[PDB]
């Protein structure tokens, strides 16, 4: 199960400052909630080689650490020790509702960024809730008040494809192969393609980009704590975004 690959001690060393008083989400993200969330998704952190299993929870934690980071260049223990400092978007004005017959907005609810992957919009809360068995359309706020559904939404994102993009799971675990178009676009297996899946339209294909470098910094630090090599193709600086 995932606690066979990452211990409570490793998880706290990775998310070193999440419980400092300056972080909004102080005391929300617990190892226990992470473990409870992971066993709703067989396959997460238990597919492939033991090395790939370790690269998966490191990559998952790296990417969600960048979406919730509270670091700054001179932060204590470096900017890559400050992931998971936030649980919700906060500066948002919008309610992130796009009227939909498929995933209808609940009156008065707002679908701003919540949890580890900062899940946004009614058309993302809907399928996520359907998959984990809770009506997230009616109560999106559960993603910022219940830490295991918070983690489940993030793992759901990780495990689900969004065609033409593969799931992040499939590429880190070796269950995705680039088509001709992906290869022609420089999209080949590695951490870089996961960044491309998550935010490639903004971040990938235009040389060194600081947000991509932030993602990679957390990945490397988590890989070192887990004692696994990083694999190759860590950036997406010359990959075309998925289209």
PDB file of C-alpha atoms in Angstrom:
ATOM      1  CA  UNK A   1       0.000   0.000   0.000  1.00  0.00           C
ATOM      2  CA  UNK A   2       1.430   3.575  -0.267  1.00  0.00           C
ATOM      3  CA  UNK A   3       2.772   3.536   3.326  1.00  0.00           C
ATOM      4  CA  UNK A   4       5.141   0.771   2.093  1.00  0.00           C
ATOM      5  CA  UNK A   5       6.859   3.421  -0.074  1.00  0.00           C
ATOM      6  CA  UNK A   6       6.629   6.624   1.985  1.00  0.00           C
ATOM      7  CA  UNK A   7       6.804   6.761   5.766  1.00  0.00           C
ATOM      8  CA  UNK A   8       5.247   9.360   8.070  1.00  0.00           C
ATOM      9  CA  UNK A   9       8.839  10.576   8.760  1.00  0.00           C
ATOM     10  CA  UNK A  10       9.568  10.991   5.017  1.00  0.00           C
ATOM     11  CA  UNK A  11       6.254  12.752   4.398  1.00  0.00           C
ATOM     12  CA  UNK A  12       6.919  15.275   7.185  1.00  0.00           C
ATOM     13  CA  UNK A  13      10.498  15.939   6.002  1.00  0.00           C
ATOM     14  CA  UNK A  14       9.155  16.589   2.491  1.00  0.00           C
ATOM     15  CA  UNK A  15       6.280  18.882   3.733  1.00  0.00           C
ATOM     16  CA  UNK A  16       8.552  20.419   6.330  1.00  0.00           C
ATOM     17  CA  UNK A  17       6.931  23.786   6.829  1.00  0.00           C
ATOM     18  CA  UNK A  18       3.281  23.123   5.951  1.00  0.00           C
ATOM     19  CA  UNK A  19       2.421  23.438   9.635  1.00  0.00           C
ATOM     20  CA  UNK A  20       4.293  26.689  10.287  1.00  0.00           C
ATOM     21  CA  UNK A  21       2.052  29.515  11.568  1.00  0.00           C
ATOM     22  CA  UNK A  22       2.490  31.510   8.325  1.00  0.00           C
ATOM     23  CA  UNK A  23       0.735  28.848   6.229  1.00  0.00           C
ATOM     24  CA  UNK A  24      -3.006  29.033   5.737  1.00  0.00           C
ATOM     25  CA  UNK A  25      -3.466  25.285   5.788  1.00  0.00           C
ATOM     26  CA  UNK A  26      -1.631  24.757   9.122  1.00  0.00           C
ATOM     27  CA  UNK A  27      -2.657  21.356  10.469  1.00  0.00           C
ATOM     28  CA  UNK A  28      -4.940  20.421   7.506  1.00  0.00           C
ATOM     29  CA  UNK A  29      -2.736  18.034   5.429  1.00  0.00           C
ATOM     30  CA  UNK A  30      -1.902  14.900   7.403  1.00  0.00           C
ATOM     31  CA  UNK A  31      -0.071  11.744   6.452  1.00  0.00           C
ATOM     32  CA  UNK A  32      -3.144   9.797   7.576  1.00  0.00           C
ATOM     33  CA  UNK A  33      -5.421  11.696   5.164  1.00  0.00           C
ATOM     34  CA  UNK A  34      -2.916  11.060   2.330  1.00  0.00           C
ATOM     35  CA  UNK A  35      -2.843   7.299   3.049  1.00  0.00           C
ATOM     36  CA  UNK A  36      -6.673   7.075   3.413  1.00  0.00           C
ATOM     37  CA  UNK A  37      -7.036   8.958   0.126  1.00  0.00           C
ATOM     38  CA  UNK A  38      -4.573   6.732  -1.767  1.00  0.00           C
ATOM     39  CA  UNK A  39      -6.253   3.417  -1.049  1.00  0.00           C
ATOM     40  CA  UNK A  40      -9.424   4.586  -2.883  1.00  0.00           C
ATOM     41  CA  UNK A  41      -7.277   4.465  -6.040  1.00  0.00           C
ATOM     42  CA  UNK A  42      -5.693   1.071  -6.603  1.00  0.00           C
ATOM     43  CA  UNK A  43      -2.713   1.539  -8.841  1.00  0.00           C
ATOM     44  CA  UNK A  44      -1.613   4.820  -7.243  1.00  0.00           C
ATOM     45  CA  UNK A  45       1.934   4.305  -5.991  1.00  0.00           C
ATOM     46  CA  UNK A  46       1.920   0.553  -6.543  1.00  0.00           C
ATOM     47  CA  UNK A  47       2.403   0.152 -10.302  1.00  0.00           C
ATOM     48  CA  UNK A  48       5.652  -0.744 -12.002  1.00  0.00           C
ATOM     49  CA  UNK A  49       9.033  -1.100 -10.591  1.00  0.00           C
ATOM     50  CA  UNK A  50       9.714  -0.168  -6.900  1.00  0.00           C
ATOM     51  CA  UNK A  51      11.721   2.785  -8.383  1.00  0.00           C
ATOM     52  CA  UNK A  52       8.665   3.856 -10.421  1.00  0.00           C
ATOM     53  CA  UNK A  53       6.444   3.476  -7.385  1.00  0.00           C
ATOM     54  CA  UNK A  54       8.735   5.843  -5.478  1.00  0.00           C
ATOM     55  CA  UNK A  55       8.943   8.262  -8.456  1.00  0.00           C
ATOM     56  CA  UNK A  56       5.139   8.346  -8.573  1.00  0.00           C
ATOM     57  CA  UNK A  57       4.487   9.569  -4.994  1.00  0.00           C
ATOM     58  CA  UNK A  58       7.491  12.005  -5.350  1.00  0.00           C
ATOM     59  CA  UNK A  59       6.133  13.372  -8.664  1.00  0.00           C
ATOM     60  CA  UNK A  60       2.557  13.626  -7.312  1.00  0.00           C
ATOM     61  CA  UNK A  61       3.794  15.410  -4.193  1.00  0.00           C
ATOM     62  CA  UNK A  62       6.138  17.688  -6.285  1.00  0.00           C
ATOM     63  CA  UNK A  63       3.406  18.847  -8.662  1.00  0.00           C
ATOM     64  CA  UNK A  64       0.786  19.470  -5.943  1.00  0.00           C
ATOM     65  CA  UNK A  65       3.538  21.124  -3.819  1.00  0.00           C
ATOM     66  CA  UNK A  66       4.084  23.653  -6.631  1.00  0.00           C
ATOM     67  CA  UNK A  67       0.267  24.349  -6.788  1.00  0.00           C
ATOM     68  CA  UNK A  68       0.225  25.115  -3.060  1.00  0.00           C
ATOM     69  CA  UNK A  69       3.712  26.498  -2.388  1.00  0.00           C
ATOM     70  CA  UNK A  70       4.349  29.223   0.111  1.00  0.00           C
ATOM     71  CA  UNK A  71       8.135  29.530  -0.405  1.00  0.00           C
ATOM     72  CA  UNK A  72      10.246  32.524  -1.425  1.00  0.00           C
ATOM     73  CA  UNK A  73      13.900  32.553  -2.617  1.00  0.00           C
ATOM     74  CA  UNK A  74      15.399  32.859   0.888  1.00  0.00           C
ATOM     75  CA  UNK A  75      12.791  30.786   2.773  1.00  0.00           C
ATOM     76  CA  UNK A  76      14.280  28.561   5.609  1.00  0.00           C
ATOM     77  CA  UNK A  77      15.286  25.204   4.113  1.00  0.00           C
ATOM     78  CA  UNK A  78      14.860  26.582   0.594  1.00  0.00           C
ATOM     79  CA  UNK A  79      11.854  27.202  -1.528  1.00  0.00           C
ATOM     80  CA  UNK A  80      11.274  23.455  -1.998  1.00  0.00           C
ATOM     81  CA  UNK A  81      10.416  22.807   1.619  1.00  0.00           C
ATOM     82  CA  UNK A  82       7.329  25.057   1.530  1.00  0.00           C
ATOM     83  CA  UNK A  83       4.748  23.026  -0.480  1.00  0.00           C
ATOM     84  CA  UNK A  84       1.256  22.484   0.901  1.00  0.00           C
ATOM     85  CA  UNK A  85       1.134  25.897   2.604  1.00  0.00           C
ATOM     86  CA  UNK A  86      -2.386  26.668   1.182  1.00  0.00           C
ATOM     87  CA  UNK A  87      -5.653  24.824   0.811  1.00  0.00           C
ATOM     88  CA  UNK A  88      -7.633  27.352  -1.196  1.00  0.00           C
ATOM     89  CA  UNK A  89      -7.356  30.008  -3.815  1.00  0.00           C
ATOM     90  CA  UNK A  90      -8.395  33.014  -1.596  1.00  0.00           C
ATOM     91  CA  UNK A  91      -7.811  36.132  -3.957  1.00  0.00           C
ATOM     92  CA  UNK A  92     -10.612  34.886  -6.324  1.00  0.00           C
ATOM     93  CA  UNK A  93     -13.613  36.983  -7.295  1.00  0.00           C
ATOM     94  CA  UNK A  94     -15.335  34.499  -9.617  1.00  0.00           C
ATOM     95  CA  UNK A  95     -17.544  31.627  -8.699  1.00  0.00           C
ATOM     96  CA  UNK A  96     -15.950  29.457 -11.509  1.00  0.00           C
ATOM     97  CA  UNK A  97     -19.386  28.336 -12.722  1.00  0.00           C
ATOM     98  CA  UNK A  98     -19.885  27.713 -16.467  1.00  0.00           C
ATOM     99  CA  UNK A  99     -23.632  26.812 -16.690  1.00  0.00           C
ATOM    100  CA  UNK A 100     -23.865  23.176 -17.705  1.00  0.00           C
ATOM    101  CA  UNK A 101     -26.443  20.556 -18.307  1.00  0.00           C
ATOM    102  CA  UNK A 102     -23.872  17.863 -17.586  1.00  0.00           C
ATOM    103  CA  UNK A 103     -22.326  19.340 -14.373  1.00  0.00           C
ATOM    104  CA  UNK A 104     -24.806  21.969 -13.159  1.00  0.00           C
ATOM    105  CA  UNK A 105     -23.612  24.742 -10.782  1.00  0.00           C
ATOM    106  CA  UNK A 106     -25.256  24.551  -7.324  1.00  0.00           C
ATOM    107  CA  UNK A 107     -26.860  27.936  -6.367  1.00  0.00           C
ATOM    108  CA  UNK A 108     -24.548  30.135  -4.400  1.00  0.00           C
ATOM    109  CA  UNK A 109     -21.634  27.756  -4.583  1.00  0.00           C
ATOM    110  CA  UNK A 110     -18.235  28.838  -5.825  1.00  0.00           C
ATOM    111  CA  UNK A 111     -15.764  26.366  -7.565  1.00  0.00           C
ATOM    112  CA  UNK A 112     -12.539  28.181  -6.950  1.00  0.00           C
ATOM    113  CA  UNK A 113      -9.207  26.385  -6.397  1.00  0.00           C
ATOM    114  CA  UNK A 114      -9.232  24.026  -3.459  1.00  0.00           C
ATOM    115  CA  UNK A 115      -6.931  21.303  -2.167  1.00  0.00           C
ATOM    116  CA  UNK A 116      -3.563  19.929  -3.347  1.00  0.00           C
ATOM    117  CA  UNK A 117      -4.212  20.319  -7.091  1.00  0.00           C
ATOM    118  CA  UNK A 118      -6.310  23.519  -6.605  1.00  0.00           C
ATOM    119  CA  UNK A 119      -9.245  21.937  -8.326  1.00  0.00           C
ATOM    120  CA  UNK A 120     -11.343  24.573 -10.110  1.00  0.00           C
ATOM    121  CA  UNK A 121     -14.547  24.896 -12.095  1.00  0.00           C
ATOM    122  CA  UNK A 122     -17.865  22.992 -11.873  1.00  0.00           C
ATOM    123  CA  UNK A 123     -16.887  20.791 -14.869  1.00  0.00           C
ATOM    124  CA  UNK A 124     -13.910  19.519 -12.802  1.00  0.00           C
ATOM    125  CA  UNK A 125     -15.650  19.271  -9.432  1.00  0.00           C
ATOM    126  CA  UNK A 126     -18.504  17.265 -11.019  1.00  0.00           C
ATOM    127  CA  UNK A 127     -16.541  14.235 -12.480  1.00  0.00           C
ATOM    128  CA  UNK A 128     -14.199  14.302  -9.407  1.00  0.00           C
ATOM    129  CA  UNK A 129     -17.209  13.923  -7.040  1.00  0.00           C
ATOM    130  CA  UNK A 130     -18.798  11.308  -9.245  1.00  0.00           C
ATOM    131  CA  UNK A 131     -15.564   9.319  -9.100  1.00  0.00           C
ATOM    132  CA  UNK A 132     -14.983   9.553  -5.293  1.00  0.00           C
ATOM    133  CA  UNK A 133     -18.647   9.214  -4.359  1.00  0.00           C
ATOM    134  CA  UNK A 134     -19.515  12.604  -2.918  1.00  0.00           C
ATOM    135  CA  UNK A 135     -21.595  15.370  -4.483  1.00  0.00           C
ATOM    136  CA  UNK A 136     -18.881  17.960  -4.925  1.00  0.00           C
ATOM    137  CA  UNK A 137     -21.181  20.082  -7.105  1.00  0.00           C
ATOM    138  CA  UNK A 138     -23.473  20.652  -4.191  1.00  0.00           C
ATOM    139  CA  UNK A 139     -20.637  21.036  -1.682  1.00  0.00           C
ATOM    140  CA  UNK A 140     -17.307  22.088  -3.266  1.00  0.00           C
ATOM    141  CA  UNK A 141     -16.177  23.361   0.134  1.00  0.00           C
ATOM    142  CA  UNK A 142     -15.697  19.754   1.286  1.00  0.00           C
ATOM    143  CA  UNK A 143     -12.413  19.902  -0.735  1.00  0.00           C
ATOM    144  CA  UNK A 144     -11.063  22.478   1.710  1.00  0.00           C
ATOM    145  CA  UNK A 145     -12.605  21.174   4.953  1.00  0.00           C
ATOM    146  CA  UNK A 146     -12.058  17.424   4.665  1.00  0.00           C
ATOM    147  CA  UNK A 147      -8.395  16.578   4.122  1.00  0.00           C
ATOM    148  CA  UNK A 148      -8.940  13.045   2.736  1.00  0.00           C
ATOM    149  CA  UNK A 149     -11.478  14.181   0.105  1.00  0.00           C
ATOM    150  CA  UNK A 150      -8.940  17.038  -0.613  1.00  0.00           C
ATOM    151  CA  UNK A 151      -6.293  14.389  -1.328  1.00  0.00           C
ATOM    152  CA  UNK A 152      -8.754  12.189  -3.218  1.00  0.00           C
ATOM    153  CA  UNK A 153      -9.525  15.027  -5.679  1.00  0.00           C
ATOM    154  CA  UNK A 154      -5.829  15.473  -6.344  1.00  0.00           C
ATOM    155  CA  UNK A 155      -5.252  11.747  -6.841  1.00  0.00           C
ATOM    156  CA  UNK A 156      -8.334  11.615  -9.058  1.00  0.00           C
ATOM    157  CA  UNK A 157      -6.737  14.347 -11.227  1.00  0.00           C
ATOM    158  CA  UNK A 158      -3.483  12.369 -11.338  1.00  0.00           C
ATOM    159  CA  UNK A 159      -5.190   9.092 -12.288  1.00  0.00           C
ATOM    160  CA  UNK A 160      -7.540  10.453 -15.002  1.00  0.00           C
ATOM    161  CA  UNK A 161      -6.622  11.011 -18.660  1.00  0.00           C
ATOM    162  CA  UNK A 162      -8.348  14.152 -20.346  1.00  0.00           C
ATOM    163  CA  UNK A 163      -7.831  13.082 -24.062  1.00  0.00           C
ATOM    164  CA  UNK A 164      -5.479  13.753 -25.919  1.00  0.00           C
ATOM    165  CA  UNK A 165      -3.473  14.044 -22.627  1.00  0.00           C
ATOM    166  CA  UNK A 166      -2.688  10.757 -20.840  1.00  0.00           C
ATOM    167  CA  UNK A 167      -3.087  10.610 -17.109  1.00  0.00           C
ATOM    168  CA  UNK A 168      -0.030  11.656 -15.051  1.00  0.00           C
ATOM    169  CA  UNK A 169      -0.212   8.143 -13.535  1.00  0.00           C
ATOM    170  CA  UNK A 170       0.179   6.398 -16.887  1.00  0.00           C
ATOM    171  CA  UNK A 171       3.244   8.355 -17.869  1.00  0.00           C
ATOM    172  CA  UNK A 172       5.243   8.014 -14.572  1.00  0.00           C
ATOM    173  CA  UNK A 173       4.390   4.324 -14.241  1.00  0.00           C
ATOM    174  CA  UNK A 174       5.514   3.425 -17.837  1.00  0.00           C
ATOM    175  CA  UNK A 175       1.977   2.779 -19.186  1.00  0.00           C
ATOM    176  CA  UNK A 176       1.979   5.526 -21.803  1.00  0.00           C
ATOM    177  CA  UNK A 177       3.878   5.622 -25.042  1.00  0.00           C
ATOM    178  CA  UNK A 178       4.164   8.748 -27.122  1.00  0.00           C
ATOM    179  CA  UNK A 179       2.465   8.668 -30.492  1.00  0.00           C
ATOM    180  CA  UNK A 180       4.255   9.971 -33.585  1.00  0.00           C
ATOM    181  CA  UNK A 181       2.806  13.405 -33.006  1.00  0.00           C
ATOM    182  CA  UNK A 182       3.975  13.439 -29.365  1.00  0.00           C
ATOM    183  CA  UNK A 183       7.514  12.402 -30.458  1.00  0.00           C
ATOM    184  CA  UNK A 184       7.547  14.960 -33.230  1.00  0.00           C
ATOM    185  CA  UNK A 185       6.476  17.449 -30.475  1.00  0.00           C
ATOM    186  CA  UNK A 186       9.304  16.309 -28.106  1.00  0.00           C
ATOM    187  CA  UNK A 187       6.844  14.796 -25.595  1.00  0.00           C
ATOM    188  CA  UNK A 188       8.685  11.686 -24.313  1.00  0.00           C
ATOM    189  CA  UNK A 189       8.259   9.801 -20.929  1.00  0.00           C
ATOM    190  CA  UNK A 190       9.450  11.629 -17.818  1.00  0.00           C
ATOM    191  CA  UNK A 191       8.493  14.296 -15.319  1.00  0.00           C
ATOM    192  CA  UNK A 192       8.499  17.033 -18.008  1.00  0.00           C
ATOM    193  CA  UNK A 193       5.465  15.551 -19.762  1.00  0.00           C
ATOM    194  CA  UNK A 194       3.487  15.596 -16.485  1.00  0.00           C
ATOM    195  CA  UNK A 195       4.158  19.364 -16.156  1.00  0.00           C
ATOM    196  CA  UNK A 196       2.982  19.671 -19.773  1.00  0.00           C
ATOM    197  CA  UNK A 197      -0.282  17.816 -18.847  1.00  0.00           C
ATOM    198  CA  UNK A 198      -0.897  20.026 -15.848  1.00  0.00           C
ATOM    199  CA  UNK A 199      -0.063  23.452 -17.336  1.00  0.00           C
ATOM    200  CA  UNK A 200       1.948  23.056 -20.570  1.00  0.00           C
ATOM    201  CA  UNK A 201       0.044  25.715 -22.578  1.00  0.00           C
ATOM    202  CA  UNK A 202       1.435  28.385 -20.262  1.00  0.00           C
ATOM    203  CA  UNK A 203       4.634  26.781 -19.097  1.00  0.00           C
ATOM    204  CA  UNK A 204       6.161  24.504 -21.790  1.00  0.00           C
ATOM    205  CA  UNK A 205       7.962  24.881 -25.169  1.00  0.00           C
ATOM    206  CA  UNK A 206       9.581  28.342 -24.718  1.00  0.00           C
ATOM    207  CA  UNK A 207      12.934  27.570 -22.972  1.00  0.00           C
ATOM    208  CA  UNK A 208      13.712  27.807 -19.188  1.00  0.00           C
ATOM    209  CA  UNK A 209      10.633  28.832 -17.258  1.00  0.00           C
ATOM    210  CA  UNK A 210      10.737  29.482 -13.482  1.00  0.00           C
ATOM    211  CA  UNK A 211       7.432  27.696 -12.659  1.00  0.00           C
ATOM    212  CA  UNK A 212       8.681  24.565 -14.452  1.00  0.00           C
ATOM    213  CA  UNK A 213      11.963  24.969 -12.515  1.00  0.00           C
ATOM    214  CA  UNK A 214       9.969  25.183  -9.242  1.00  0.00           C
ATOM    215  CA  UNK A 215       8.181  21.895 -10.020  1.00  0.00           C
ATOM    216  CA  UNK A 216      11.496  20.174 -10.775  1.00  0.00           C
ATOM    217  CA  UNK A 217      13.142  21.512  -7.600  1.00  0.00           C
ATOM    218  CA  UNK A 218      10.478  19.829  -5.421  1.00  0.00           C
ATOM    219  CA  UNK A 219      10.675  16.646  -7.473  1.00  0.00           C
ATOM    220  CA  UNK A 220      14.415  16.347  -6.994  1.00  0.00           C
ATOM    221  CA  UNK A 221      14.281  17.102  -3.293  1.00  0.00           C
ATOM    222  CA  UNK A 222      11.471  14.512  -2.821  1.00  0.00           C
ATOM    223  CA  UNK A 223      13.320  11.910  -4.942  1.00  0.00           C
ATOM    224  CA  UNK A 224      16.430  12.423  -2.814  1.00  0.00           C
ATOM    225  CA  UNK A 225      14.477  11.994   0.410  1.00  0.00           C
ATOM    226  CA  UNK A 226      12.935   8.864  -1.042  1.00  0.00           C
ATOM    227  CA  UNK A 227      16.350   7.799  -2.312  1.00  0.00           C
ATOM    228  CA  UNK A 228      15.317   7.216  -5.931  1.00  0.00           C
ATOM    229  CA  UNK A 229      16.841   8.566  -9.143  1.00  0.00           C
ATOM    230  CA  UNK A 230      14.880  11.214 -11.051  1.00  0.00           C
ATOM    231  CA  UNK A 231      14.557   9.353 -14.381  1.00  0.00           C
ATOM    232  CA  UNK A 232      15.115  11.474 -17.559  1.00  0.00           C
ATOM    233  CA  UNK A 233      13.313  14.251 -19.413  1.00  0.00           C
ATOM    234  CA  UNK A 234      12.636  16.350 -16.360  1.00  0.00           C
ATOM    235  CA  UNK A 235      11.615  19.565 -18.133  1.00  0.00           C
ATOM    236  CA  UNK A 236       9.238  20.520 -20.912  1.00  0.00           C
ATOM    237  CA  UNK A 237      11.347  23.454 -22.227  1.00  0.00           C
ATOM    238  CA  UNK A 238      11.315  22.078 -25.791  1.00  0.00           C
ATOM    239  CA  UNK A 239       8.050  20.101 -25.856  1.00  0.00           C
ATOM    240  CA  UNK A 240       5.014  21.527 -27.629  1.00  0.00           C
ATOM    241  CA  UNK A 241       1.956  21.717 -25.326  1.00  0.00           C
ATOM    242  CA  UNK A 242      -0.665  19.067 -25.862  1.00  0.00           C
ATOM    243  CA  UNK A 243      -3.294  20.201 -28.438  1.00  0.00           C
TER     244      UNK A 243
END
